[PDB]
Design an enzyme around this catalytic site. Structure first.
Site, PDB file in Angstrom:
ATOM      1  N   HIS A  43     -13.322  -3.444   1.694  1.00 15.43           N
ATOM      2  CA  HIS A  43     -13.608  -3.642   3.103  1.00 15.43           C
ATOM      3  C   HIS A  43     -14.538  -4.820   3.394  1.00 15.43           C
ATOM      4  O   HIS A  43     -15.391  -5.174   2.587  1.00 15.43           O
ATOM      5  CB  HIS A  43     -14.252  -2.384   3.679  1.00 15.43           C
ATOM      6  CG  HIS A  43     -14.881  -2.600   5.020  1.00 15.43           C
ATOM      7  ND1 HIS A  43     -14.156  -2.594   6.193  1.00 15.43           N
ATOM      8  CD2 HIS A  43     -16.150  -2.926   5.362  1.00 15.43           C
ATOM      9  CE1 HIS A  43     -14.952  -2.911   7.199  1.00 15.43           C
ATOM     10  NE2 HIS A  43     -16.165  -3.119   6.724  1.00 15.43           N
ATOM     11  N   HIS A  62      -4.427  -0.417  -2.322  1.00 15.80           N
ATOM     12  CA  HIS A  62      -5.616   0.424  -2.244  1.00 15.80           C
ATOM     13  C   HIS A  62      -6.826  -0.196  -2.940  1.00 15.80           C
ATOM     14  O   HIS A  62      -7.945   0.302  -2.798  1.00 15.80           O
ATOM     15  CB  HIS A  62      -5.322   1.790  -2.865  1.00 15.80           C
ATOM     16  CG  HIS A  62      -4.812   1.705  -4.268  1.00 15.80           C
ATOM     17  ND1 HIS A  62      -3.556   1.225  -4.571  1.00 15.80           N
ATOM     18  CD2 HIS A  62      -5.410   1.971  -5.454  1.00 15.80           C
ATOM     19  CE1 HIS A  62      -3.403   1.194  -5.884  1.00 15.80           C
ATOM     20  NE2 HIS A  62      -4.515   1.641  -6.442  1.00 15.80           N
ATOM     21  N   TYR A  90     -11.537  -1.823   7.223  1.00 11.08           N
ATOM     22  CA  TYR A  90     -11.073  -0.439   7.133  1.00 11.08           C
ATOM     23  C   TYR A  90     -10.919   0.222   8.503  1.00 11.08           C
ATOM     24  O   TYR A  90     -10.207   1.221   8.646  1.00 11.08           O
ATOM     25  CB  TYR A  90     -12.010   0.371   6.229  1.00 11.08           C
ATOM     26  CG  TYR A  90     -11.823   0.102   4.738  1.00 11.08           C
ATOM     27  CD1 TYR A  90     -10.997  -0.933   4.282  1.00 11.08           C
ATOM     28  CD2 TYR A  90     -12.460   0.898   3.786  1.00 11.08           C
ATOM     29  CE1 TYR A  90     -10.814  -1.159   2.916  1.00 11.08           C
ATOM     30  CE2 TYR A  90     -12.283   0.681   2.424  1.00 11.08           C
ATOM     31  CZ  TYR A  90     -11.459  -0.345   1.995  1.00 11.08           C
ATOM     32  OH  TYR A  90     -11.271  -0.539   0.647  1.00 11.08           O
ATOM     33  N   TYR A 129      -3.909  -4.825   7.418  1.00  6.23           N
ATOM     34  CA  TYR A 129      -2.874  -3.908   6.955  1.00  6.23           C
ATOM     35  C   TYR A 129      -1.756  -4.092   7.981  1.00  6.23           C
ATOM     36  O   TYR A 129      -2.025  -4.175   9.176  1.00  6.23           O
ATOM     37  CB  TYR A 129      -3.353  -2.461   6.994  1.00  6.23           C
ATOM     38  CG  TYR A 129      -4.439  -2.126   6.011  1.00  6.23           C
ATOM     39  CD1 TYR A 129      -5.634  -1.557   6.441  1.00  6.23           C
ATOM     40  CD2 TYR A 129      -4.265  -2.335   4.640  1.00  6.23           C
ATOM     41  CE1 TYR A 129      -6.624  -1.200   5.541  1.00  6.23           C
ATOM     42  CE2 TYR A 129      -5.256  -1.980   3.725  1.00  6.23           C
ATOM     43  CZ  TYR A 129      -6.432  -1.410   4.186  1.00  6.23           C
ATOM     44  OH  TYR A 129      -7.420  -1.027   3.306  1.00  6.23           O
ATOM     45  N   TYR A 164       0.836  -1.189   0.000  1.00  5.29           N
ATOM     46  CA  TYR A 164       0.000   0.000   0.000  1.00  5.29           C
ATOM     47  C   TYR A 164       0.876   1.246   0.000  1.00  5.29           C
ATOM     48  O   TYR A 164       1.169   1.816   1.050  1.00  5.29           O
ATOM     49  CB  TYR A 164      -0.916   0.008   1.232  1.00  5.29           C
ATOM     50  CG  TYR A 164      -2.211   0.773   1.047  1.00  5.29           C
ATOM     51  CD1 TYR A 164      -3.438   0.132   1.193  1.00  5.29           C
ATOM     52  CD2 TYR A 164      -2.215   2.138   0.742  1.00  5.29           C
ATOM     53  CE1 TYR A 164      -4.643   0.824   1.043  1.00  5.29           C
ATOM     54  CE2 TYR A 164      -3.414   2.837   0.589  1.00  5.29           C
ATOM     55  CZ  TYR A 164      -4.624   2.172   0.741  1.00  5.29           C
ATOM     56  OH  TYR A 164      -5.811   2.857   0.588  1.00  5.29           O
TER      57      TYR A 164
HETATM   58  N1  SFG Z   1     -17.710  -3.494   1.432  1.00  6.92           N
HETATM   59  C1  SFG Z   1     -17.828  -2.501   0.515  1.00  6.92           C
HETATM   60  N2  SFG Z   1     -19.081  -2.189  -0.003  1.00  6.92           N
HETATM   61  C2  SFG Z   1     -19.245  -1.197  -0.940  1.00  6.92           C
HETATM   62  N3  SFG Z   1     -18.159  -0.487  -1.388  1.00  6.92           N
HETATM   63  C3  SFG Z   1     -16.912  -0.784  -0.860  1.00  6.92           C
HETATM   64  C4  SFG Z   1     -16.672  -1.800   0.114  1.00  6.92           C
HETATM   65  N4  SFG Z   1     -15.317  -1.829   0.417  1.00  6.92           N
HETATM   66  C5  SFG Z   1     -14.814  -0.853  -0.352  1.00  6.92           C
HETATM   67  N5  SFG Z   1     -15.697  -0.188  -1.158  1.00  6.92           N
HETATM   68  C6  SFG Z   1     -15.545   0.888  -2.174  1.00  6.92           C
HETATM   69  O1  SFG Z   1     -14.157   1.006  -2.511  1.00  6.92           O
HETATM   70  C7  SFG Z   1     -13.541   2.203  -2.017  1.00  6.92           C
HETATM   71  C8  SFG Z   1     -12.227   1.869  -1.248  1.00  6.92           C
HETATM   72  C9  SFG Z   1     -11.080   1.531  -2.216  1.00  6.92           C
HETATM   73  N6  SFG Z   1      -9.836   1.707  -1.394  1.00  6.92           N
HETATM   74  C10 SFG Z   1     -11.301   0.064  -2.659  1.00  6.92           C
HETATM   75  C11 SFG Z   1     -10.903  -0.219  -4.147  1.00  6.92           C
HETATM   76  C12 SFG Z   1     -12.115   0.242  -5.030  1.00  6.92           C
HETATM   77  N7  SFG Z   1     -13.287  -0.639  -4.910  1.00  6.92           N
HETATM   78  C13 SFG Z   1     -11.742   0.604  -6.478  1.00  6.92           C
HETATM   79  O2  SFG Z   1     -12.463   0.149  -7.403  1.00  6.92           O
HETATM   80  O3  SFG Z   1     -10.775   1.385  -6.665  1.00  6.92           O
HETATM   81  C14 SFG Z   1     -14.648   2.938  -1.237  1.00  6.92           C
HETATM   82  O4  SFG Z   1     -14.492   4.341  -1.367  1.00  6.92           O
HETATM   83  C15 SFG Z   1     -15.920   2.339  -1.837  1.00  6.92           C
HETATM   84  O5  SFG Z   1     -16.327   3.004  -3.049  1.00  6.92           O
END
Ligand code: SFG
EC number: 2.1.1.364
Lengths: 4, 239
Positions: free
Chosen positions: B181, B177, B219, B189, B129
């Site tokens: 979650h 990243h 997270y 992490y 990360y």
């Molecule tokens: N359990 C979850 N349910 C819905 N959205 C999630 C969840 N975990 C992470 N996210 C989404 O992913 C973001 C966190 C990113 N670090 C994760 C990678 C991301 N999904 C991407 O496509 O770049 C958040 O701001 C959300 O939009």
């Protein structure tokens, strides 16, 4: 606060 | 006298030190946690100047034997700043490239996700990360819409993969990243000292994962979090  | 310096994350630096006891030379190497994949080449005081992809074939009485992999890709220490994520955003990490890939998430409406290419056991480093380094104040003082990829590194640094680097077509040096979650995650992490990215975090499995299984992490948002998170939280507490 606004970060993993 | 060959010296091996192992990091808590499993990676290591190996080679002969100079008269000043420093990892300086053309035959120094950083070895990834698999104790097989390595970056062999020029290092100065442990810092990678020009490392080439190699394989640690064997070791005899602490003396490693490396053989170069086909190719001309070289890597170097390239720590990010608040505005620079990488000098070569499209040069992937060789260790990570053999363990994970990006595809549509299995989680509904979650966009892309990170998937394993191989079956591995517990505590396996799978992805890195990396990202730009910004302050907690900057992150906490802005809209959640801009913190989809922010991950705290420590008390003073937050790692981020901002637009347009959140797209694989614009950035693939690291892929951590892209892990989505889950409240029942198969990964966490963890701290990692990377020869190219420097001090960052990585994605490490909590248990056995199968080939093509989606990698997820908790997270850990304070229970101050996105709507999708709050929704999945309710759906989690229930059921
Ligand atoms: N359990 C979850 N349910 C819905 N959205 C999630 C969840 N975990 C992470 N996210 C989404 O992913 C973001 C966190 C990113 N670090 C994760 C990678 C991301 N999904 C991407 O496509 O770049 C958040 O701001 C959300 O939009």
């Amino acid at each position: 606060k606004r970060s993993k | 006298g060959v010296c091996w310096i192992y990091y808590p994350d499993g990676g290591s630096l190996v080679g002969e030190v100079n008269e000043d006891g420093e990892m300086t030379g053309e035959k120094i190497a950083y070895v990834y946690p698999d104790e097989r994949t390595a970056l062999y080449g020029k290092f100065i005081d442990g810092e990678m100047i020009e490392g080439k992809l190699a394989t640690l074939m064997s070791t005899e009485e602490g003396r490693p034997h490396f053989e170069l992999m086909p190719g001309n890709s070289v890597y170097h220490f390239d720590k990010s700043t608040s505005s620079c994520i990488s000098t070569n955003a499209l040069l992937p990490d060789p260790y990570e490239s053999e363990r994970v890939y990006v595809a549509e998430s299995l989680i509904s409406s979650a966009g892309e996700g990170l998937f394993s290419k191989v079956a591995v056991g517990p505590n396996t480093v799978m992805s890195f990360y990396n990202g730009v380094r910004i302050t907690h104040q900057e992150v906490d003082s802005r809209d959640w819409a801009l913190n989809g990829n922010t991950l705290s590194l420590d008390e003073e640094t937050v790692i981020d993969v901002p637009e347009p680097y959140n797209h694989v077509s614009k950035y693939c040096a690291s892929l951590g990243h892209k892990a989505n979650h889950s409240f029942t995650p198969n990964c966490i992490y963890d701290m990692f000292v990377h020869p190219r990215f420097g001090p960052i975090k990585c994605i490490r499995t909590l248990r056995a994962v199968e080939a093509d299984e989606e990698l997820t992490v908790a997270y850990g948002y304070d229970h101050e979090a996105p709507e999708w998170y709050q929704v999945e939280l309710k759906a989690f507490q229930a059921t």
